[PDB]
């Protein structure tokens, strides 16, 4: 079956940096667009960043455009997220997911079809 596993660091301090990495299996990595979302204990679901199937295009929420980078290594089937400053309001369980965008040769998606286990980012 399809699997998606979040990995990365744990405790961070304000003003630092953190790289998260998702390993995908059970499907062709390069055939799906992906995104990063977060769930804070005191919040609901929210979207953070979106990456295309190739990786050429990236999109972010206004609150992180100047700090976060979403990237992907298609040969390693690995999605990466580099974060900076890591403010107290950024503490949450972060997830990566497949779906949410399409190449315009595949049908419309705009949905997050497969969700990983998640990893907790604590400031």
């Amino acid at each position: 079956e399809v699997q998606l596993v979040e990995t990365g660091g744990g405790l961070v301090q304000p003003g630092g940096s953190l790289k998260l990495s998702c390993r995908a299996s059970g499907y062709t990595f390069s055939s799906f667009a992906m995104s990063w979302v977060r769930q804070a204990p005191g919040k609901g679901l929210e979207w953070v960043s979106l990456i295309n199937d190739r990786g050429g295009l990236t999109f972010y929420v206004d609150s992180v455009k100047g700090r976060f980078t979403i990237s992907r290594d298609n040969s390693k089937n690995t999605l990466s997220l580099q974060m900076h400053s890591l403010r107290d309001g950024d503490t949450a369980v972060y997830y990566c997911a497949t779906g949410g965008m399409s190449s315009a040769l595949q049908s419309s998606k705009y949905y997050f079809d497969f969700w990983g286990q998640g990893a907790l980012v604590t400031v």
Binding site: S102, A104, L105, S107, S108
Partner: protein, 433 residues
């Protein structure tokens, strides 16, 4: 929710007929409007592509025909036109005191040649072949006198075939069937795109296909309609048969001036013995090759049908005999022993006659005079295919032949020319601003 998106560079093509370019890395087969071949020609196999080929609707053969006719006419224009040669010939037998079968074939004729000055005449003696001289009714004339003036080919120009590569013009591409045992028509699942074809030797022959390509695996019998007796049957062999052809007699060539700078060359005394030209084919090799052809015939016509071979004895000599360019000289070989077997459920000698006056491509009105060649001629060629035609309990058929387009078609059967259509459309989920 879909919109039209326009694409340029789409790998789609449509059947088309256009002009092809000559490529080849003096010789009458060397076209002046021809460029060197690519130092590294490309062949790109098309995976999961099937294309329908039809060797009988291939317009590359018509282009090759027109190219050869144009090339030969342009090459013969700057040569001496033998208009004063059609004169009364006082002829006797060159060597009547012979016991070989060549005796009576060579005539020793005397005439006048106009010299160079218009007020003088030069009595000249020369030898001609029997097949080139007809009695006026001793007094004889050249066979061509009642057809057209005959042009002397320039002796400095070689007639040895040079492989010619046909290249697509920009915007077009050549597809190769590249499929083992392809019968000349129908889908080819192994299509490969080539910028230029391989080299095609422009070999001129009848009945037997010489110095051509071989079948990849087995003997291939190609016909527009295998059950139509009126269609030509082209048989491609997978096992080449060597044929040893020779004009064993020796020769010398004399040269005289007939006009203001126009030299005429003619056959002189024969040295040594006078012997007839002939070809040699080993009997076992022919028997096995013919058996393979018969096996393919059994596949098409049945295993228990009686198969009979016969000679195409009716028609013009250029058709009833094999036409072979051996060392530049034109041989007309009987070779009846090759198509004499009947099939049911050391070596062969093939006599040949020599002609100096020929009419190529069955074009009546354009005779050509071949210069003589000094010495003794021997050559070896590869028989790579056969031409057959057919006239039931018994199926009797004959070599037939007599049309050069089929020979080029035999080599070009696997190629098709297509036009590239770079434009196309498709639905996509996008919209222009």
């Amino acid at each position: 929710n879909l919109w039209v998106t326009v694409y340029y560079g789409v790998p789609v093509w449509k059947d088309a007929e256009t002009t092809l370019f000559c490529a080849s890395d003096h010789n009458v087969w060397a076209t002046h409007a021809c460029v060197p071949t690519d130092p590294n020609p490309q062949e790109i196999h098309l995976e999961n592509v099937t294309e329908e080929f039809n060797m009988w609707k291939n317009n590359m053969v018509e282009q090759m025909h027109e190219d050869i006719i144009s090339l030969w006419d342009q090459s013969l224009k700057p040569c001496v036109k033998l208009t004063p040669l059609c004169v009364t010939l006082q002829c006797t037998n060159y060597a009547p005191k012979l016991r070989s079968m060549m005796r009576g074939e060579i005539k020793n004729c005397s005439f006048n040649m106009t010299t160079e000055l218009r007020d003088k005449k030069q009595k000249v003696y020369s030898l001609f072949y029997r097949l080139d001289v007809v009695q006026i009714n001793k007094e004889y004339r050249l066979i061509n006198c009642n057809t057209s003036a005959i042009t002397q080919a320039c002796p400095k120009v070689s007639f040895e075939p040079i492989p010619i590569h046909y290249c697509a013009p920009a915007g077009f591409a050549i597809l190769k069937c590249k499929d083992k045992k392809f019968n000349g028509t129908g889908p080819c699942p192994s299509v490969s795109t080539v910028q230029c074809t391989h080299g095609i030797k422009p070999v001129v022959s009848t009945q037997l296909l010489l110095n051509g390509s071989l079948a990849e695996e087995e003997v291939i019998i190609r016909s527009e309609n295998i059950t139509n007796n009126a269609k030509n049957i082209l048989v491609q062999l997978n096992t080449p048969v060597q044929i040893n052809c020779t004009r064993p007699s020796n020769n010398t060539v004399k040269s005289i001036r007939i006009g203001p700078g126009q030299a005429f060359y003619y056959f002189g005394d024969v040295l040594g013995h006078v012997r007839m030209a002939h070809c040699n084919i080993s009997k076992a090799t022919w028997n096995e090759t013919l058996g393979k052809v018969v096996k393919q015939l059994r596949k098409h016509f049945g295993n228990n049908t009686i198969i009979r071979f016969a000679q195409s004895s009716g028609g013009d000599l250029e058709v009833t005999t094999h036409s072979f360019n051996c060392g530049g000289e034109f041989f007309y070989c009987n070779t009846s022993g090759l198509f004499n077997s009947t099939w049911i459920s050391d070596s062969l000698i093939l006599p040949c006659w020599i002609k100096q006056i020929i009419n190529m491509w069955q074009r009546i009105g354009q005779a050509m005079y071949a210069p003589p060649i000094q010495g003794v001629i021997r050559c070896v060629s590869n028989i790579t295919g056969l031409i057959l035609t057919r006239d039931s309990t018994t199926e009797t058929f004959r070599p037939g032949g007599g049309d050069m387009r089929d020979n080029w078609r035999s080599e070009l059967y696997k190629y098709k020319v297509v036009k590239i259509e770079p434009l196309g459309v498709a639905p996509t989920r996008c919209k222009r601003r």
